[PDB]
Subunit: 462 residues, 4 copies
């Protein structure tokens, strides 16, 4: 019908997938701490290790879709696997080895879906791909906004009326049917994308490669599950991946009139610094909002609604949609890496500033409003950190793993604010959060000083 | 003599008509609540239903003036009817069916005057019509400024010296003689406009069409009066008009390479949101200033004057004249719909912020100064909402009725802050106003988020 | 030698003349109130009547210098007369008729000096006259800065060491020798200006015209003296001048395609409004600083110096020199008349804001610092009000007298804050100043609204 | 190899030299007051007299390197002498005549190193010398940042673990090995600079000139040492140098169409004003941070680290690196001399503002953060004051000595806040610092008024 209509199909299946995922991520940390018996120091590492596997997962699935299998049907393979994942979350048990299987299925499902969905978005428009993606991302933000608001409300509602289990699991069931809605939506308008495939979707399926990847995918689920439960398995894995990145960089030092890549090393170091700050938003800030934030939302002394601690994470997509047009009007260069560090700093200082003026053991919820406004602003102007990163094949891969490991590294930083489960009084848990965030803000000021001091080197490469 | 001299005549008769009208609107809500025995929940609906009939009234009179009758003599017909309306208000009785006849006469009189007066202003300058109207509007603002200051003072003065009735009715008598002054002013300088008429004013009067419209006008007065008193008659009327707009839109969906009109639907939705916020200024804010605002105006601890609650509405034309040149210097695009929502939000938050810092049961009057500064600023940059709205005949009409119905809808929103007449203590009526305004400000923040999130769709139509 | 050297001579004699004058004006109001037995309501009218005669005095002397006598030797005649004036102030008596003779001599001396000094400055550069005057004015500001700091210190010093009289009179003696220094400075470098005269200085002196003006000058001194003491003589004089301006305007109405002069009438009305606000700075603000300002100047809790109430007026030339380059950098149109009204408003609100936060009966002296910063800023961007004012001969004269009368009118406005000399407690005199200034600030806000509302008329003349 | 590689060598030896020096300057005032028995009024004059000899020292060494000796080997001669200086500081005695020998060796060593190091930086790039120096200065700021943080920590650490002496002396030993590191770093990459020398380094060494300068250098060390201990010897020296500058200026008055140099005199006067304010940062601010600043650094109520009073001076290089790119983005003229005065003023007012809100006898350390942000900002936009200063040979020299003397003059201004060593209570020493800084801020406001009032003269030379 039109290229917009093919863009309509992929944006609809993309909207409903990020719906299911972010509706699950907002509750996955609370689910381990509250519903399951996980202490927070373990729930931080288990999620962060999963967030590391999730981030590097599109590297394989992006290659499987266009070199081996089909970018459409590999994207659909990822979607079907993701259906299983959230369906695996909705069965009501207290089995640990049951939830880790779902998270590993989510990791394998994510790698096969996300890059391929965004890959053919680039193929649909052959250079207004920038106009399409900017509408493609606003569809992501508007979709994840609903789920992060909807799914924690279902969790609160069904638990109040139906007992103890169905609340958390209907929330996950909502994420599962979200995937099925987008799959059904794609099944009806698939005709436009059927004529717009990758290079091998034109050609029929290779069952040798199909059986190989399906066996490796099941192998990967089990390999990802083991990594999550046994924390030390992930440590050595993170260590092994960390030494590899340090090796690819030194091997690149012994090469070439090519001083400009020592700046790429500096851009990688600050990237490791950045993901530790953003990973903090899903770990400590969720626990901070869980224990020491007054969910009662009152504007100038009148009650509106009582928050759910997972719905605070919906303020990230909201603030992205509110600030992206404002930055566009600001039109009428890796130094902006330093500017993002400064924004992240005052965001950690907001939570610190929250401790002084508002004291009841619980700081107000308005902190989560002004806080997430800062982190999302910081995220807005810097994210896509290594997309513009510039014989470069192992260089891009080193950037990937360094960003994946820092996801896990952000989890061990959040453990600095891991409350012992023998500390229940919120008056006593307030210092452990404000102390972490305050020096985290100081550390972000140091990164600002670092990136600003290193600026004469960046201007010298140009 | 000159085109400016023909513009001088129409601007003088326009200045004196908006003088009579706004001098009556500032007191019409108080007149029903104070002088008459109307509870506020009824005075809100009766005025809002009248403000709905007033807004859509120029649709007929604008067509009667240039297609059937004469834009000059239809404008003059409206003016003469408006003379009767304010004269019908000045007779001192406690009869309900007596005031509703005046309001209906005002509705019929308004439709015949306002569009035709502004119609020939466009005809006088054949493209500096933008230069004329900008002077034509400043004449409106300076005229309605006097009456909204003058007429409530007469109401206070004559009531203090002459008892109980003459105060309110001399205020309306002032609005009536205001119309007669402009009619007398037009009767002397009519020679310039006599040579500048519509298409049929050239031709003599058609008494068949004259008698038909005069009978329909009297029919319309009675039809408008019945709608006001019996609130349910207006509800079904508003319902019937609401279903019609929903029908014209769907009938337009089944038509056409014409996706751009789904944005016109979005522009209509936010317009319904907008008029509910501005209708709030005449309903709840007048009652808020009536019961819970300290009329004592003191600047840094010295008494100046004591306000009349109706004179606060004169701050809207004043702030329009103060801010329109400032915005002009700001020169050295339906996203400004979102910007207006943000301004309206902080305006409702001013009244909310008023509740905390200033507490005696009565908030200060400076709230009405900074408040109306915000609403008028918001109004300044967005109003004329659907003038630039773009086979389009039923589309423009759907925009009209959707904006008229929202006038009545703003009245039912004001009823959320309808004080029971058994609640006299201002300390107890302060929460009912601050609670409405505060969440109204939150609702305007949501509209800001909506219009900003929908911005990639508006940029895609261009 | 050079045109700069001829500009050096006139700027040096100009610097020393404004030295003597402003060194006398800063103390003339205090001298009548403190040293003499004048109640403030009389000292306000007597000075304001003199400030009116001073302002319109250059009209005659500017014409005497180039049409009748010699712009150089008329300027020198004014200077010699001004020598007598400050010498007439230095003789220690308590005779009223003795000081009024000096003030009248100052009025006659001022009219003969000021325009002629600035006249040949225009002649020296034949179009960089704008570059010369901008240096010519900075010489005025730096000269009047010294005297307004120096002369009140001499008054305080000599009174403490020598008794009661010599303090005030040595201060005036300092102003007299200031004139003599500039006369001596001119007597040495007169060779450059001797070749740069007016049209008749080339020609020899006409003793018929010389004797006529010298007799009229003595006649004018006595006529000016009588006007000052007997207040009613000035009232009828001000009335007679007021009716004349109202007559010249109506006589101009009966003339001419010349609607643009009704804006000149509006520019005159706001000018009358402006001079009332600036005349307030010399009248009420001097009395406010005299009675209710803590002369103790301490910055963050450490004593620097103790002010003299007359030295606060030196903050006007200081702030002029500080803000004129800032406005120049602001480069990278009678609406600025409205902007000046807004600045004057917040200046009167500073003194009002001073009343609340600082209360001991005496407000801090920092008010005089931030206050004079506002008035001088306001003065900076609007002053020279009718220099750009555009068969125009009686029109310019009407602008002159309307600005002169408003000087006296500003004196009667200051009388609204005239303290009875039976009210000594500063706690009781604080309201009478804060009440005047606060509503004066409200009146300046009205002028802002007026000039902004009238802005569509000004844009229509262009 | 490349011009960058020759720039790499000089920037590495420069980084390590400013490392040793600023690591010594941060502790030299405290060393005299704390470790030695010097009262602060003497430690201020002794350092300021040394800072005067240090500033004018590059005048000889800059001429010795290119006219007599070799810019490379004269720079290396200075470096070797500077090695001796910090080695002379590391031997643990209480002998006064022992430390003064080191400071004099530092003065002779500094003059021979600093200009020659920066001289050939200009020679390496023959016009991107501005691009090299901007990277050359960032290497200076990053190097002095480490030492000013590192050396006071060694002083605190070794004193706590090893007693009383080794702390201060290992800190100086760290500065000595810093010089040796850069000398060793230069000894390895000397091949690139060996081909890039001055005019006579090409030619072999002249042992007549070598022996003469080495004897004069030893003579200069003893001459500099005597000047430091005996304060009156420096006074007459400063007097003799002061009369010389007043003589060179008058001798230049009797010369020449050359009025523009009376502005150079004005630029010199404000320069004397400037160096007194910046010299204050090393004298009084170090003592203020020593006695009346809470070294406990807590952000929003959580302890980070406890400061060392010498490490506050590391905030100057840090803020330079943070603000220099911000000023570069401000791109999208000796009036900026006035702007720097205004910045310095609010910096002295920060310390004054510190006295009111924070009172325990000790003001917070955040004052040192916001304070040094102002002084460094002021320094950023004005420093290099007389580099652009424009038969001019004695004119440049007069500018040098006037800037050197003001270093000593800043020391006598700091003595206005010299606490008697019989005043130990910090509650009693707080006024003596806040009183100095507050009126120092007032004096900087006067310099702002002066430079702004003199601005019409500067615009007239262009």
């Amino acid at each position: 019908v039109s290229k917009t209509h093919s863009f309509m199909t992929v944006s609809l299946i993309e909207l409903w997938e990020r719906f299911g995922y972010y509706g699950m991520q907002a509750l996955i940390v609370y689910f381990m701490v509250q519903r399951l018996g996980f202490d927070d120091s373990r729930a931080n590492l288990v999620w962060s290790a999963c967030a590391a596997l999730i981030y590097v997962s599109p590297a394989i699935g992006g290659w499987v879709g266009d070199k081996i299998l089909g970018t459409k049907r590999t994207m659909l393979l990822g979607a079907g696997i993701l259906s299983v994942g959230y369906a695996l979350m909705t069965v009501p048990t207290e089995n640990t080895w049951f939830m880790f299987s779902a998270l590993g299925v989510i990791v394998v499902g994510n790698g096969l879906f996300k890059p391929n969905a965004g890959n053919l978005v680039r193929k649909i428009y052959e250079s207004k791909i920038d106009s399409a993606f900017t509408i493609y991302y606003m569809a992501v933000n508007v979709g994840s906004t609903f789920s992060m608001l909807l799914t924690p409300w279902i969790k609160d509602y069904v638990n109040a009326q139906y007992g103890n289990e169905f609340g958390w699991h209907a929330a996950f069931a909502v994420c599962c049917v979200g995937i099925l809605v987008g799959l059904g939506n794609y099944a009806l308008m698939h005709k436009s994308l059927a004529n717009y495939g990758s290079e091998p979707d034109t050609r029929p399926v290779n069952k040798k490669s199909l059986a190989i990847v399906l066996a490796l995918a099941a192998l990967s689920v089990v390999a990802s599950a083991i990594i999550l439960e046994y924390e030390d398995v992930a440590r050595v894995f993170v260590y092994a991946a960390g030494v590899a990145v340090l090796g690819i960089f030194f091997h690149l030092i012994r090469t070439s009139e090519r001083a400009g890549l020592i700046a790429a090393l500096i851009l990688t170091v600050q990237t490791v610094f950045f993901f530790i700050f953003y990973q903090q938003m899903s770990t400590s800030l969720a626990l901070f909002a869980l224990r020491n934030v007054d969910w009662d939302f009152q504007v100038f002394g009148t009650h509106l609604w009582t928050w759910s601690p997972a719905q605070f994470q919906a303020l990230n997509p909201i603030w992205i949609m509110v600030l992206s047009p404002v930055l566009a009007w600001s039109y009428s260069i890796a130094a902006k890496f330093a500017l993002g560090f400064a924004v992240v700093a005052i965001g950690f200082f907001i939570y610190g500033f929250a401790g002084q003026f508002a004291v009841n053991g619980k700081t107000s919820s308005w902190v989560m409003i002004w806080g997430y406004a800062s982190y999302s602003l910081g995220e807005l102007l810097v994210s896509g950190l290594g997309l513009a990163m510039i014989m470069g094949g192992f260089m891009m891969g080193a950037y990937f793993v360094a960003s994946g490991i820092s996801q896990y590294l952000g989890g061990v930083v959040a453990n600095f604010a891991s409350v012992p489960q023998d500390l229940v009084d919120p008056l006593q848990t307030l210092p452990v959060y404000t102390n972490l965030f305050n020096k985290l803000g100081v550390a972000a000021v140091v990164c600002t000083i670092i990136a600003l001091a290193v600026l004469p080197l960046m201007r010298r490469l140009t």
